[PDB]
From Swiss-Prot:
Residues of the full protein shown: 174 to 668 of 704
Location in the cell: Nucleus
Enzyme class, spelled out: transferase
Consequence when changing F382G: Strongly reduced formation of N(6),2'-O-dimethyladenosine cap (m6A(m))
Family: Belongs to the CAPAM family.
UniProt catalytic activity: a 5'-end (N(7)-methyl 5'-triphosphoguanosine)-(2'-O-methyladenosine) in mRNA + S-adenosyl-L-methionine = a 5'-end (N(7)-methyl 5'-triphosphoguanosine)-(N(6),2'-O-dimethyladenosine) in mRNA + S-adenosyl-L-homocysteine + H(+)
GO MF term set: mRNA (2'-O-methyladenosine-N6-)-methyltransferase activity; RNA polymerase II C-terminal domain binding; RNA polymerase II C-terminal domain phosphoserine binding; S-adenosyl-L-methionine binding
Protein name, per record: mRNA (2'-O-methyladenosine-N(6)-)-methyltransferase
Reported regulation of activity: Cap-specific adenosine methyltransferase activity is inhibited by zinc.
GO biological process, one term: negative regulation of translation
Amino acid sequence: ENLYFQGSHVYWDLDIQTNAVIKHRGPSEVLPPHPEVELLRSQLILKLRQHYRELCQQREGIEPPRESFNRWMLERKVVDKGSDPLLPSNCEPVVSPSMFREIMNDIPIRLSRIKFREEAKRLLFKYAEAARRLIESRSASPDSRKVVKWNVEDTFSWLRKDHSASKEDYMDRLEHLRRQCGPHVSAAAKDSVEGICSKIYHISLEYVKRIREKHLAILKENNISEEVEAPEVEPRLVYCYPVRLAVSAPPMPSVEMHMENNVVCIRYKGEMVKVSRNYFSKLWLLYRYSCIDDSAFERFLPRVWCLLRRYQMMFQGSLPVHVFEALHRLFGVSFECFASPLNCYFRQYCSAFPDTDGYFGSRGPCLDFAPLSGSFEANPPFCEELMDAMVSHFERLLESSPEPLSFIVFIPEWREPPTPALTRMEQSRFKRHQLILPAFEHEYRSGSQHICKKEEMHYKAVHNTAVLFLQNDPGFAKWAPTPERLQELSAAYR
Ligand SMILES: Nc1ncnc2c1ncn2[C@@H]1O[C@H](CSCC[C@H](N)C(=O)O)[C@@H](O)[C@H]1O
C-alpha cells in the first residue's frame, strides 16, 4: 500500500502487440511538427474562434452554440482534401452542414430551459418578437411574411386575453408557434447562416497558407526539401506501424521543462503546456515504441510540447481500464480506431493528427487507415458526419477482406432520435450482437484524463451506450460474441 507517487496509476497496456494488418503504405505528406509553427497555429485558431463568435453576434445576435466550432473541425476533416492537419483547407461543400444546423437551432433565439411560469411567458414572447422581426428585416416571399406575421400576432392576442394560463400552457403554445414559424424563418436566415459557415471556412483557408508559408520557410532555412525519396514499394501485407512523415524533420529549437508536484511543465517562448507525471512517463514509452527518426530521442521534449499544444487548440471520454482488458482478453482487441496519445490504451491506435501523434504510436486518422485484419474498438467523438463515414468505412473493410476482422463500436444513445450512424450499424449484415449499457449504470474515464486528478478520472454515463459487434465471417469465427464471452464483458461493467 505504497504508491510511487500520488496519482501513479496506469491506464494503458503498452505491451499488447497489434493484430491489425494493412497493405504497406507510403509516408504521409504532412510536415513534421515544429514549435514555431504550432505557436503560429495556436494563435490563428484563437483568432478563428474569435471570428466565429463575432460573426454569430454581428449577424444573428447570438453566441455560438457550445462546441459547435470544435464539432465543425471534426466534420470538415471528414471531407477535407487540404494539407493542414488541424484547420480545413479544401472541402466540398464549402458550407458545413454541421455548423449550419447548430446555428439554425438557435435562430431567431436560443431557447433556454424555463424554471417558472413567468419564465415560459418570457420565452414565448421573446420568440414571437424575434420571429416576426426576422421576417420583416430579411427578404422573404410576401406569402412567407404573412404566415409569420399573423401566426405571431395570434400568440400576442392570446397572451393579453388568457391571463389564467399555467407553466404548461405557455410551453405548448411555444412549441406550436415554433412549429409554424420554424420553416419560414429558416429560409429567410439561410443566406445569413450560410455566409457564416462560408466566411469561417475561407478565413481558415487563408490561415492554412499563412501556416504553410512559415512552415516552408523554416524547412528551406534548414536546407530541407519537399520531395519524394523512394516511392518504389514492394507490395506486401504487414502488421500496422505508426504513420510516417515523408519530409525529414529539421532540428528542433530548445525547450525548457520542470516538474512541480508530479506535474510536468514544458515551456517554449513563454508558452507552457502541462501534463501529469504518469502520462509524461507514458508518452516516453510511446515515443520509444514508435519513433524511428530520433535515434538518440533528442527531439522528444519539443515534440511533446507540440503534441500537448496541438490538443490545447482542439480543446468524449474513454472506456474504463477493466473494460479494455476484457475486450482484449475475450475478443482479442488490440487497437483503438479513435484515440490520442493522451487517452490511448494500446500502443497502436488512430488519432486526429498524424504529424504530432505518429511519433507516439498513432496510425493517423481512422478514415485513412484501411486494415485487412484485426480486432478493433471504436469510440468515436459525437459528430454525425464522422460517425456516418465511420460505419461506411468499416463496412467497406468488412466487405472486401477474407481475413478475420472485427469492430466493437461504442456509441451512446444520446440523441432522442438516434443518429443515422447508429441505425445503420443496427441493420448491418456484419452486426453479430448488439449490447446496451444502461444509463447511470456504467462509467467512462475523463476526457481531461492526462492532467486531471485520480478522484476526477471516472464519471457515470448519464445516457445509454450501444455496443455493436461488427464482424465478417472469419472475424466472427475467431472473436464471436458467445454468451460466455458476453457474460464476462458485462461483468467488467460492474
Ligand atoms: N479522424 C480521427 N481519426 C481517429 N481518431 C480521431 C479522429 N478525430 C478525433 N479522434 C479522436 O477520437 C477520440 C475519441 S474519445 C475516445 C477515447 C478512447 N480512445 C476510447 O476509445 O474509449 C478523441 O480523443 C479524438 O482525439
